[PDB]
Every structure is written in structure tokens, then in C-alpha cells.
Ligand binder design. Structure first.
Ligand SMILES: *[C@H](O)[C@H](C[C@@H]1CCNC1=O)NC(=O)[C@@H]1C[C@H](OC)CN1C(=O)[C@@H](NC(=O)OC(C)(C)C)C(C)C
Ligand SMILES: *[C@H](O)[C@H](C[C@@H]1CCNC1=O)NC(=O)[C@@H]1C[C@H](OC)CN1C(=O)[C@@H](NC(=O)OC(C)(C)C)C(C)C
Ligand SMILES: [Cl-]
Ligand SMILES: [Cl-]
Ligand code: NA
Ligand code: NA
Lengths: 301, 306
């Protein structure tokens, strides 16, 4: 029993982290086989941060302009290419610690582990969710770019996020490992702002099911709701719509606990209306939305 | 910016986890040099669960009764001994992935990372605190015993916890790596319970500093207090006493933010006496007490591990 924000063990990713320097900029790279992936803004100069022409900047680089360090070892760059907002540096040695891996682009509401790194060395690991507004609420300082987000269901690392940018509200933006940003963001210093965020309803419901599995019932009630009436209420609290896909996905947790999905929706409606009246759920006095249904089944079963 | 509940990178510990099976019980062991450490209750059985005599149960055991697997490779046990509530299985092979490490016993209020493992395979990592009542609020299922807690300093892993037991309230009890339980707990099926717990005051203060560093300032006020006066409020709200050593440890955060510790204590006093008035601090509507001052300094400055 118990319920924690639980990350994946980070060792398989730690073995891939390197330091990349170009000019006066240092950040992290991800070393898989004979390629190092990193944010392309490592090649920006201070003159050129608003409207960098990355194709023009990159054609001017020699391989020796990229200093790649793996622990105490300098890796030799032998080629380079750009894929969207990621730079791929070909190096002369394959990483002997390369895990089984894949690249996945995730949808809002999905969670992943972040291995925050500086100068190619790991600082710590934590859980994040892709927010509905395509930001993540990370913990990132100068030099953290190139840190990655990942899941390790089974024995294969699925890389889903690479860190690029901090936005004015203190939240974070980045790309998949094919270099496509999540959300409308761009790797330029032009004015950008996150949209209004919303709460990930399906995840809140998953976490209420976790609470029941762990022995809580105080927030249950004798009411139910239609799906459309639930959504009409929930949107008044800046919750995301609940779709039939979400209802289907919650089926297994519904079966395990004996609480129909729309009955749990009625519990959530009442919690939004009333608050917790001095109580807590799984050690929180707020409705938690960064556990997915899959996360709850992973941790409770 | 940002502030998250952050665990240590777990790779140095993942390479030490093995599976240990004795009879019909499987749990995890920690393989360091040529010794595997695991809970001694691995030797109990369903006809012995209530009041085992461990002294006497181990002599009946031989080396080949312990099956130890490092991934898909069997490790041959060549000796066995007990130390307090931990079993030490000598194996014929030193772990080539043994990190620089030491065994430490932590104090209530200190935090650590747990590498939750099943069948010798690491499955998750999370951050915990040793509660004042000597339990931890972990997340553990059947088969998790032998999972360990640790901190890292520079390049050295300090192992501080091995998991043994779940108590009736769903919190957890275990030992240091010398097999001494934290708290007044024993490894057998007799009645036991977590005592009443308290809140780790110095950690709440550290987290309020983390909040100020990240721009959350609404709870600050013009007032200050004294150590004596605040400790009367702490006692009233089942908070741990604040000592002068706690005040000194927070010195760096006081200097960085301009909020002296007793100035922040006046904030905490008002929060305890008045609540949050509907507001949140670092995304929480509760006062968080599982970040130490060092945790805050480390995360806010980007310290890394070699
Ligand atoms: C890469 O290490 C770094 C990580 C940042 C630094 C502070 N926290 C982080 O997460 N990223 C950048 O420095 C990135 C490069 C951009 O210039 C090419 C500027 N970057 C920012 O993150 C800055 N944000 C920014 O300019 O935001 C807009 C576009 C909204 C103005 C940030 C340093 C203010
Ligand atoms: C080791 O893998 C396992 C971990 C437990 C399983 C459920 N969550 C965990 O944290 N520990 C035990 O199974 C342990 C062995 C004891 O018998 C020698 C019984 N154990 C318990 O954790 C049980 N607790 C218990 O008996 O509590 C008292 C002493 C208060 C009755 C638990 C499985 C009920
Ligand atoms: Cl005053
Ligand atoms: Cl909370
Ligand atoms: Na993609
Ligand atoms: Na004050």
C-alpha cells in the first residue's frame, strides 16, 4: 500500500548523458549508438537569439566546433545534421551503454520521468505530465537543456521529451526526439506565452480510483451523472472534457473497485463543489492530475 | 525555476539489486562486493510466521537453500550469517558494479530516495522522509522487501534503509543496513502500530524558503518571533521543536532571501493559526515537510552526481 509520485529508475538514461559545448554555450546531449542528440539552439550566438537562421548557422560549423564530453572522455564529432529543432552529432564511437530504446511523441495528459542534468551529469529524477497547454511543470536551471523525459515500461526506454526553454510563468517547453516542439513554441527569443492551462480530468479520476484501492471512501456518494452533464460542470472549473475514450480507459479501475466511471464522476463533481473540508486524499489537499490510469495500475498492482 | 519532489539518480544502486529466494519466499537483496544483504525474515515460513526464533532457524539452513539471481545469472552462496535483522549471504563473485558506498543510519526528518524493486528488478524511484515516528510513507507491495533507500554525496552512495514491513495504517518499517530497525518495531507477526506522528518543522521552513526562491511570497509578513515563543506554537500544532542548530542550518537560505528564520517562523505561525485562505504554496494546499534544507539548496543550485 501507499501511493507516491514514482519515477522510473534512471540508470539506463544516465549512461547516455553527455556534455555538448559550442561557442560559449554548454548543455546536455543524449548519446545513443554513434549519435548525440541535443537542442539546436546550442549554436546560437548572443548577437542572434531573436531570429536565428539555424540552417545558415549550422553550415558554417566544422565538426571540431562541437566539443562533446562523456565523463572524462572527449568524443570526436565526425558529422552533423539538423532534424527540426534537434541537432544530431555523429561521433566516432558508439555508446556501449546504449539501452533498448525508441522515440515516442506523447499526447497531453501523459506522464514521464525527467532526469535533470547539468554539464552531462545527473542531478535528480522526477515525474512530470504533458499539460493540456503543451508545457511541463519542471525543475530546470541554466544548463539543463538537453535533459530528457522518458518512460521504461518493460525493458525499453521510450524517450518522449528533450528540454529547450523556460517560459515567463516558470513552466517549460521542449521537443520530442525528432525535434518537433510540443505546442506552438519556437526556439527563438520572440515573445511567447503558454495558453491557459486546464486540469487533466481523466487523471484526477484515475487518482480517485487509486485512493479507493488504498482504502479511502469518504468522498464517494450515492449519485451518478450523465457524461455530458459532467462535462458541462467540469468545464466551469477549467477541467478538460472527459471523452468516451477516457471512460473506456478507466474501465479496468472501475471493475477492480466496483465503482462505475460515471459514479466516480459524480464524486468529482461534489469535490469540486465542496472541497475537502479539512480532509486529504492520498496525502494531498488538492485534486492531483499527474497520475494516469496506466500509472495507477502500474503502482497499485 | 520550478521545484519538484526530486529523487537521486538511481543508476549506481540499480546495478546492486538481485533476487533472493528461500523456500517459497522471494524478495530483493543488495549485492555489494561479495556479500548480498537481505531481510532475515526471508527464512520464515507460513507455519512459523508468528514468533520465529531466527538464531535457530538459520542453522537448519545451508548455502544452497538460498537462490540468488543477478538478472539471469545465478550467484553461488558460499556462506551465510545474520547481523541483527539482516542476513548476509557471502557469494563467490564480487559485484563488478559495486559503487563507492557506505552504510549510514539516518535521523528522523532526514530524506532519502527509495528504489522500489520486485524480483530483483528495479521498478520505481521516489523520495521519502524518515518520519518522527520512525516510519516511512512508502509505496510498497508484496515482494518489495529488500528494496533500499539511499542518498548520494559527490560520488559515494550512502545506504540508509532496507524495507521489511507494512504496518496497519499502510506506512512502512525497515532497518538500516546493519539490520537495526528504525523505530520500536520487530520482524514478526505480533501486534504493532505506528505511533502518533508530528510534522518536521525545519523541513517546512526549508520548503517555505524554496517557495520564496520560486516567487511565492504571499505568506510573508512584517513580523518576527523568538525561538521560545514559536516552539510553544509548534508544540500546540504537533510540530517538532525547532532548535538553534536548525536555525543555523537554514542560515544560507535566510541570507539569500532576506527572510530571517524567526521572520519565517512568524509566517509559519500565522499559517498554522489561520490557514492558507484558499491559496497554495508551490502547488500544495498543505505544508510540505519532506524537503530538508540541503534538499532545497541542492535542487535550487543544480548539484550533480559523479
Ligand atoms: C538551456 O539550458 C536553457 C534552459 C532554461 C534556462 C533557465 N531555465 C531553463 O529551463 N534554455 C535557454 O536558455 C533557452 C534558449 C533560448 O534562446 C535561444 C532562451 N531560452 C530560455 O529558456 C529563455 N526563455 C525565453 O527566452 O523565453 C521567451 C521566448 C518566452 C522570451 C529563458 C532563459 C528566459
Ligand atoms: C516483503 O516483501 C513484505 C512487504 C510488504 C507486503 C505488503 N507491503 C509491504 O510493504 N513484507 C512482509 O510480508 C512482512 C513479513 C512479515 O512476516 C514475517 C509480515 N509482513 C508484513 O509486512 C505484514 N505486516 C504485518 O504483519 O504487520 C503486523 C506485524 C502489524 C501484523 C503485511 C503483509 C500485513
Ligand atoms: Cl514583530
Ligand atoms: Cl496539497
Ligand atoms: Na516523432
Ligand atoms: Na515575518
Amino acid at each position: 500500500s501507499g501511493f507516491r509520485k514514482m519515477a522510473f529508475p534512471s540508470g539506463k538514461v544516465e549512461g547516455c548523458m553527455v556534455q555538448v559545448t559550442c561557442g560559449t554555450t554548454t548543455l546536455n546531449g543524449l548519446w545513443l549508438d554513434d549519435v548525440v542528440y541535443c537542442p539546436r539552439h546550442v549554436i546560437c550566438t548572443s548577437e542572434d537569439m531573436l531570429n536565428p537562421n539555424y540552417e545558415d548557422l549550422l553550415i558554417r560549423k566544422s565538426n571540431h566546433n562541437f566539443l562533446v564530453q562523456a565523463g572524462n572522455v572527449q568524443l570526436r564529432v565526425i558529422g552533423h545534421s539538423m532534424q527540426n529543432c534537434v541537432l544530431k552529432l555523429k561521433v566516432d564511437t558508439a555508446n556501449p551503454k546504449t539501452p533498448k530504446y525508441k522515440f515516442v511523441r506523447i499526447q497531453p495528459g501523459q506522464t514521464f520521468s525527467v532526469l535533470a542534468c547539468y554539464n552531462g551529469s545527473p542531478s535528480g529524477v522526477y515525474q512530470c505530465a504533458m499539460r493540456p497547454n503543451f508545457t511541463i511543470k519542471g525543475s530546470f536551471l541554466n544548463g539543463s537543456c538537453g535533459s530528457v523525459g522518458f518512460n521504461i515500461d518493460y525493458d525499453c526506454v521510450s524517450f518522449c521529451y528533450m528540454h529547450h526553454m523556460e517560459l515567463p510563468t516558470g513552466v517549460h517547453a521542449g521537443t520530442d526526439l525528432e525535434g518537433n516542439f510540443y505546442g506552438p513554441f519556437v526556439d527563438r527569443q520572440t515573445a511567447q506565452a503558454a495558453g491557459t492551462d486546464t486540469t487533466i480530468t481523466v487523471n484526477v479520476l484515475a487518482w480517485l480510483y487509486a485512493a479507493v484501492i488504498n482504502g479511502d471512501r469518504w468522498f464517494l456518494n450515492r449519485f451518478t451523472t450523465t457524461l455530458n452533464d459532467f462535462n458541462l460542470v467540469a468545464m466551469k472549473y477549467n477541467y478538460e472534457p472527459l471523452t468516451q475514450d477516457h471512460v473506456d480507459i478507466l474501465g479496468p479501475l472501475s471493475a477492480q473497485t466496483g465503482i462505475a466511471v460515471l459514479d466516480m464522476c459524480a464524486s468529482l463533481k461534489e469535490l469540486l463543489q465542496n472541497g475537502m473540508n479539512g480532509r486529504t486524499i492520498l496525502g494531498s489537499a488538492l485534486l492531483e492530475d499527474e497520475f494516469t490510469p496506466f500509472d495507477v495500475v502500474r503502482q497499485c498492482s
